[PDB]
Design a protein around this ligand. Structure first.
Ligand SMILES: Nc1ncnc2c1ncn2[C@@H]1O[C@H](COP(=O)(O)OP(=O)(O)O)[C@@H](O)[C@H]1O
Ligand code: BEF
Ligand SMILES: [Mg+2]
Ligand SMILES: [Zn+2]
Ligand SMILES: [Zn+2]
Lengths: 411, 132, 98, 119, 208, 67
């Protein structure tokens, strides 16, 4: 099988698809069972009727995944359902090649479990698994749509690339040199989709009735009508009256999912008996925890402190070079104007001689990363990087995850 | 037309540097003072002789105040406290000023036009001197 | 306070340019002023400017076509150092002129 | 801000804090405590202030105004939005800008041939 | 205006300290014996740190069912005793074989497996891994993982020097207002407006 | 007498109280060493000189002028 398969293991959503395919196939990673006990698959969660009381179960814990059977079931469903996903169909995968993305700080126990499972259960001929950060320096191999933001202004792979991501689980700061991440200087942040969703739930429960039992609706609200402060918290607060939005809660009798109503536009004039919740302060207050954790009554440092610490740990020779090449990945960065505000804030604390540059993909960043590892698989360096099945059989199971795909090797 | 250069921005830190050598010529003085300035475009540090340090000390400026340094005459004036510390206290006498634009140091010229009578009046009526 | 709207945009100190000479007689004598006018430190800044611009032109003719370029200096440990050195020496020459 | 003041505490400098000062202003609708950051502590200690009297504090100017003793009654929120309008003639502006302390010449009448460029 | 001469008592007056002061009127008394003994026998302190991280972890959870199990995991990660922090700090299964068969029937709509089994030690390890039902806690306190590895994974990734760089921001506890900040008399919570104060009094003024 | 001063040394600890310090004045063509009295030290304490400066001294009244 000359064209390998591209799989992105994500805590929230799983991105899988052949390297030939342009876009990944979106698939959630969770099992939802209603109050009555009826359980629904991840892809079938959006097809359910009742969203009032849902209990979410996923193999991915806060650090890594521990329940491998559920992950294996999800992978079997996603890989062997040609009817579910148009065109795609996997018969055996014996000769296929797989490129996987995992957590940059996965536990060695779970790492070896993953290696054994993928090598034996799926009978894959060759595999190359690494964190998403390693694949980013290979974007120079192809020409694509890339946006750039300058903080100061108002082989094929590149050695110098600072990669920052904000996933559903958490946020990591990774400095990468020569394509090898600098694990000593790697910094992490606990801010993630769960934190924002829970904070939105608590704020709405304080300003309205209690909806903490509802999570899908709050997640949809956050993904629809949440944005970061364009200039500062005070500027947004002063104009928060103008920047006011009203969300119509869905009615199970009529609509499964609600919609956002903007008072400025009149294209939705139809009345509806269902109540409407207005959102003025919460539109930008929740995203502000990235820069000002004190708003949410937490003592966490923040993104800028983490970036400064990571730069300080790095050798001084490459410190100015790192900020010149910064790329943002993850679903949390889909919020508007987040990248420009981040660039301005980081440039403010930087010395004058150093220029801040930020690169951001258009559209969802998860698809961008999936295309990134697909392009890496297309690269000739992948052929030398990938590990054969026979070599894994010859060596011990721990040798691969301690030498080739193990962060301890690069420590 | 005259050209002037100005260092301005929020005061991050200031540090007197005292030489350990008496040298016989003086008893106790600071060799130089290092002050870092911050603005929107970036940050910069400076090294100042004791005269400017005495001036800024007379200006009564601590960390967190936006200041104004003129390179030509060494003039130092305190614009005010930066608005970032507005919420530091429930109430405060001091006004708050937004952080200035420009990196730290700017170059500019003034093309102010003045008639000779103003020159004669200024020469006849000086404004300098701190004498009673 | 309302009248103290920023004037430094369109004001001149008028003392830096020596137009308030009426108070110079309080502390300065004629011979000291003549000596201080004769003993100007000019032609030294010119020498320093020349000695710096020699190396500046050397670095220019060496690699300045791609040194100051943002794309070339984005990922290069040597080109970026050359560009920062050029910026530094330009800053020193400008400061010396001032 | 304004209203009846019920509690004022002021402490000297310690290594933990340069100056800690808490005051309590009670109105008809409200009664809360503000934190004094040094400068207003000095302003309040400049003139003797006793609890139970109506005072007004201008945050921007940083001055203290006493409206009397509790003779009057509070009204509501401590902090309110209002504008002050001043009616000043051109001559008064010229006299003010013509001297080091020009507003005194508004009454003493010693303006003395204000310069034309000032006008 | 200003009084030039003021009566001053030497032992009473002190420039260091300036103090002035003014159904049944009764102060508030705490009747909790635990609180009283805690007061008697005793940049943020460890208590505030513990409360903040406990609140953060409770908010990080997605379901109510996992809330009571969160403090055990938090204590294991922090290393503090579990029951001690549970008692001292006041807050605020996944797999089933029948569910397994139900999900089997759920995705039995389309499947293309190739069954094949051989009795080997590697297959035994595969079966053990697949049927694990082990919590993340079970892996955490397991002796398989080296202590240095755990320290690197947990206590090393977090930053240590730059505690805070951006200026502190304090807003109204109810609506987030900032122009008018006033601490509550009893519970010390920052309040801004009339409606916010009224809503705080009966709901969030726990110490009242 | 106008000329740049090389260095000034005063024995404030060996004897203390105008211990007759010495300073060297340099010109482009010549340079010598002068002996300084008590009044010289008292005058030089005012308008402190840290060497490397061009100054002129008056022969008659002994006035210190920093050029
Ligand atoms: N349109 C959107 N607007 C705002 N936030 C979004 C949007 N889409 C997704 N997100 C957020 O991005 C996160 C997805 O993270 P993801 O990249 O899936 O992490 P992982 O790859 O580890 O699963 C979710 O927590 C969600 O809250
Ligand atoms: F681990 Be994440 F949510 F990308
Ligand atoms: Mg992810
Ligand atoms: Zn409020
Ligand atoms: Zn309260």
């Amino acid at each position: 099988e000359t064209p390998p398969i591209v799989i992105d293991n994500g805590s929230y959503e799983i991105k899988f698809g052949p390297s030939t395919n342009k876009k990944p196939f979106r698939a959630l990673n969770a099992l939802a069972k209603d109050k009555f006990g009826t359980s629904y698959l991840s892809n079938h969660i959006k097809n359910i009727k009742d969203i009032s009381s849902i209990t979410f179960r996923r193999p991915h814990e806060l650090g890594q995944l521990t329940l491998w059977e559920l992950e294996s079931c999800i992978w079997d469903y996603c890989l062997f359902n040609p009817s579910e996903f148009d065109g795609f169909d996997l018969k055996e995968g014996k000769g296929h090649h797989l490129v996987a993305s995992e957590s940059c700080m996965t536990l060695p126990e779970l790492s070896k479990h993953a290696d054994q499972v993928i090598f034996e259960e799926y009978e894959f001929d060759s595999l190359f698994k690494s964190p998403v950060a390693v694949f980013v320096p290979f974007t120079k191999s192809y020409k694509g749509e890339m946006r750039t933001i300058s903080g100061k202004d108002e082989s094929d792979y590149h050695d110098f690339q600072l990669v920052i991501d904000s996933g559903f689980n958490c946020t990591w700061i990774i400095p990468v040199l020569k394509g090898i991440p600098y694990y000593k200087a790697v910094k992490k942040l606990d801010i993630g989709g769960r934190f924002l969703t829970g904070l939105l739930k608590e704020t709405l429960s304080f300003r309205h009735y209690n909806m903490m039992d509802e999570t899908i609706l709050v997640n949809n609200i956050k993904e629809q009508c949440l944005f970061v402060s364009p200039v500062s918290y005070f500027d947004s607060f002063k104009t928060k009256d103008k920047h006011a939005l009203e969300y119509v809660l869905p009615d199970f009798q009529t609509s499964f999912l609600g919609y956002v109503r903007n008072p400025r536009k009149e294209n939705v004039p139809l009345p509806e008996d269902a109540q409407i919740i207005t959102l003025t302060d919460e539109l930008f207050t929740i995203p502000e925890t990235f820069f000002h954790p004190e708003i949410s009554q937490i003592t966490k440092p923040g993104i800028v402190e983490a970036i400064l610490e990571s730069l300080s740990m790095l050798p001084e020779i490459v410190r100015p070079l790192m900020v010149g090449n910064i790329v943002c990945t993850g679903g949390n960065f889909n919020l508007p104007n987040f990248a420009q505000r981040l660039a301005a804030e980081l440039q403010r604390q930087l010395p004058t001689d150093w220029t801040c540059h930020v690169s951001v993909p258009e559209g969802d960043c998860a698809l961008f990363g999936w295309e990134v590892m697909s392009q890496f698989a297309k690269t000739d360096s992948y052929r030398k990087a990938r590990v054969t099945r026979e070599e894994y059989y010859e060596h011990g199971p721990d040798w691969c995850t301690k030498h080739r795909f193990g962060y301890q090797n690069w420590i | 037309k005259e050209t002037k250069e100005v260092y301005e921005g929020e005061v991050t830190e200031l540090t007197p540097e005292d030489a350990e050598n008496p040298l016989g010529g003086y008893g106790k003085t600071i060799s130089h003072v290092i002050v870092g300035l911050k603005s929107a475009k970036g940050t910069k540090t400076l090294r100042l002789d004791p005269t400017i340090y005495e001036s800024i000390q007379r200006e009564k400026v601590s960390i967190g105040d936006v200041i104004y340094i003129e390179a030509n005459t060494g003039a130092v004036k305190r614009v005010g406290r930066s608005d970032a510390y507005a919420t530091e206290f429930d109430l405060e006498t001091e006004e708050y000023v937004p952080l200035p634009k420009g990196e730290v140091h700017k170059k500019k010229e003034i093309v102010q036009d003045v008639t000779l009578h103003d020159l004669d009046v200024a020469n006849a009526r000086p404004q300098g001197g701190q004498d009673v | 306070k309302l009248f103290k709207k920023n004037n430094q945009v369109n004001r001149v100190d008028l003392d830096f340019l020596n137009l308030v000479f009426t108070l110079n007689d309080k502390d300065l004598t004629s011979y000291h002023a003549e000596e201080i006018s004769k003993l100007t430190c000019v032609k030294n800044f010119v020498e320093e400017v020349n000695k710096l611009r020699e190396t500046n032109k050397q670095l220019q003719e060496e690699f300045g076509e791609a040194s100051f370029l943002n794309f070339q200096d984005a990922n290069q440990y040597f080109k970026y150092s050359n560009k920062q050195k050029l910026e530094g020496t330009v800053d020193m020459l400008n400061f010396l002129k001032m | 801000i304004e209203g009846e003041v019920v509690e004022i505490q002021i402490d000297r400098s310690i290594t933990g804090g340069h100056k800690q000062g808490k005051l309590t202003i009670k109105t008809t609708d409200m009664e809360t405590i503000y934190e004094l950051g040094n400068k207003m502590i000095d302003g309040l200690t400049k003139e003797k202030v006793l609890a139970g009297d109506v005072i007004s504090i201008d945050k921007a100017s940083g001055k203290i105004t006493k409206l009397g003793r509790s003779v009057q009654c509070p009204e509501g929120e401590l902090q309110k939005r209002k504008t002050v309008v001043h009616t000043v003639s051109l001559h008064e502006i010229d006299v003010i800008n013509s001297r080091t302390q020009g507003f005194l010449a508004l009454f003493t009448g010693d303006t003395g041939e204000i310069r034309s460029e000032v006008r | 205006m200003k009084a030039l001469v003021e009566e001053i008592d030497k032992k009473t007056y002190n420039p260091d300290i300036y103090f002035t002061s003014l159904s049944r009127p009764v102060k508030r008394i705490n009747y909790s014996l635990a609180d009283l003994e805690a007061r008697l026998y005793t940049r943020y302190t460890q208590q505030e740190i513990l409360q903040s991280d406990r609140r953060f972890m409770e908010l990080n959870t997605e379901n109510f069912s996992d809330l009571p199990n969160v403090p055990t995991l938090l204590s294991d990660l922090t290393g503090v005793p579990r029951d001690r922090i549970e008692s001292t700090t006041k807050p605020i299964w996944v797999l089933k074989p029948e569910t397994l068969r139900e999900i089997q029937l759920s995705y039995k709509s389309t499947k293309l497996p190739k069954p094949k089994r051989k009795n080997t030690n590697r297959i035994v390890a595969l079966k053990k891994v697949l049927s694990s039902k082990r919590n993340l806690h079970s892996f955490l306190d397991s002796a398989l993982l080296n202590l240095m590895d755990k320290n690197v994974i947990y206590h090393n990734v977090y930053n240590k020097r730059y505690f805070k760089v951006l200026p502190l921001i304090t807003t109204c506890s109810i609506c987030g207002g900032y122009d008018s900040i006033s601490s509550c008399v009893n519970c010390g919570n920052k309040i801004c407006s009339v409606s916010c104060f009224k809503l705080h009094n009966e709901t969030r003024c726990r110490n009242r």
